[PDB]
Amino acid sequence: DILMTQSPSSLSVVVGFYVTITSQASNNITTYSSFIFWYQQKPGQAPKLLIYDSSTLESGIPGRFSGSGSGRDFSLTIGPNQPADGATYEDLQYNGEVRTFGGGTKLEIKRADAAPTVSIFPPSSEQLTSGGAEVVCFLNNFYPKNINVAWKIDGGERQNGVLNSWTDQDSADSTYSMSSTLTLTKDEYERHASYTCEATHQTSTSPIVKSFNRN
Amino acid sequence: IVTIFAIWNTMMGTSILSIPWGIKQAGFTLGIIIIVLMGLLTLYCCYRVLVCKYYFGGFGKWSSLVFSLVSLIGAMVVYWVLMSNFLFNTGKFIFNTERVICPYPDVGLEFDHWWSKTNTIPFYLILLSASFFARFTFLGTISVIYLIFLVTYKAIQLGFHLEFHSMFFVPEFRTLFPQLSGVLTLAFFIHNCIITLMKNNKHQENVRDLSLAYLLVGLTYLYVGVLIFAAFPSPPLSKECIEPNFLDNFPSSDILVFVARTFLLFQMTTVYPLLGYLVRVQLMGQLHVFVLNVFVVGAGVLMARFYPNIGSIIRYSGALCGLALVFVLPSLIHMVSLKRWTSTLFHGFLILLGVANLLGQFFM
Amino acid sequence: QIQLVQSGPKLSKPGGTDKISSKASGYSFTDYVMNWVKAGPGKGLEWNGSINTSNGYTTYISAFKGRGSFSVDSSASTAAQQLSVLKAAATAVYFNARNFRGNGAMDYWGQGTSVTVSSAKTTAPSVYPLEVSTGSSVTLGCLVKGYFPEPVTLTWNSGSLSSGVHTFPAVLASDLYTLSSSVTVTSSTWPSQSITCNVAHPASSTKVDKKIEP
16 A cells, blocks of 8 residues: 655645646555656546656646656646646556555635625525525635625624535636525514625725615 | 477477467466476377378378368468568667557558568568578577577566456466467477477487477476566556567567567568478479469468457467367377277377367357 | 446435446447546545456455445446445545556546435425626526535526526535525626526426526
């Protein structure tokens, strides 16, 4: 059983720049051509073969992918970066009777900072007639990933009943997105009027607030 | 003496280049037992001689000549197939690699280099002998001695492995035990020139010299193929991979592989005019013709261009011939010429095994 | 066009069993080797065994000897894998992939098979359109709430609306999933045209269309 220690675990690079992902094998995966390979995997997609036999480039893969190394120390380089490289990269050895993978390397494309576009949604009519009520607040196409969102019910920072979700980095504009849906009851939702959605980000000292009044 | 070496030299040649594959078919611990068992019967059969004069009469007649012919027909086909494999690889070595490959089947620079046909023009001209034998013999000793140096030095370059028992390996007692027996019969390609040779030496217990040459040739074949089968990168690669020709598991350019293929190509080239035009023409007869040469050349040419699985021919040929002269004719002749306790029962069994081998090849 | 297409998403009961298939097309099935791989959450990939087809020999990794069982249907050109007696830990995505010996890594992969191990009951989703509450561009939404297990496919106007869309990943809360998606179209497009939300949940035989109105 061969251990593949892959470093770094995370890694951010600006567009137009090297990334140097490295692999270090516990034993030696060389037999006569060295048997390491590099894979790329975007979310929800099958992994994609970039480089076989450490340094030979698959057909169809762009030339900006290069492989080097032999024996026990291997490195992968992406010549110039494009946003289509935002994924996780793994290395594989097909040399021992128990094939092993690396820990993975999550590449993050660094773009110019970009402020989120915020929009808020009150409960629907079909929602209430069946009971219950939720307030959705979308934060779309922003950068960087770090962002915080705080709810307010009539100025009361309420924190119970929140559910968030985040998109992986967009493969075109390298932005993020998030959906926070605050869920209450029809009976508790009607006990107020003003529901606000506050979002603060690197781009602004002053948080972005989107609010509405029930009636 | 000189005669053991002489017998050992003639028996070798290509025959061997298809042994690890036979073992992969049969199995590792089984193939070794097949080679031993096949080696005792083959040496035992060679004992039972005391050609055509001994196989004349008894209502059968020239049935042995056609069977003897098949052994000659297929050797010509193998060299034709083998030459293109060696000729084309020799060419691809042009000036403007310790690698083992499981080649992909189904078989500018491409298209035009592999023809097998370009080969036919030089062969047709030469097929018209004493000079070819003068040029020959010398090249067979070099090739088999070089080839066994390669098998050794390549096995030392990476061999060990082996796990006995599956995806990387192959079972030790595979069911394809009969194909190895079929390929292995031709390994004893002498049962047709011993008596025309055995008296050329000082004779008399003769028997020891005959047995020793088999043990040598038994050991030479067994030493070979074991190292190849026991050293092939089974944990990166896998068995199964060893396509019948063992050198086939080497690619486009190995300097050790290239030298060995070229010595064989030089060896076979000088042996084929002498094997066809000097031998096949005589047995058939039993600008004059120049059309019998066409059918032997043509059958092998079509074979090599089409289906060029060498072990697919060393089983049928070597096995149909073996059932014939190797085994049906010695037991019957001994029995017919007896003039029991258990000798007939033993002899009958061996006849059954010959027919079993031909039957065995048809059945997977 | 080489292609490995796998079976659909499976919901297995604890202790239950299932069989996962992969249908090869575009190459001689017996000239290549079929391999299987596992992808746990966050954790890397795990080779769980492989099988040669010309001679039927398999090789496992000891960590999986006793869960994965390998088959090959040499005529159908498909390769199957059986996972027996599942627990919560075996919930992952199972990939299958081609491999030629030596001169090759795994060059072609299947689209993936998601296996969920839970005793929960399949519920159908409740879809709610997110109306807008004023001059730039406008963003719409569709909210999918209270469903299980996890496929669900969400499109806008039957797929004729692909750009400007954000389909968010489901989140689990008390054995039920909730999903949300947004489109941002021009102020001149809505509500002049009709924009509807297409939610499908094949486990519960549910297909819903939901038109966003002011």
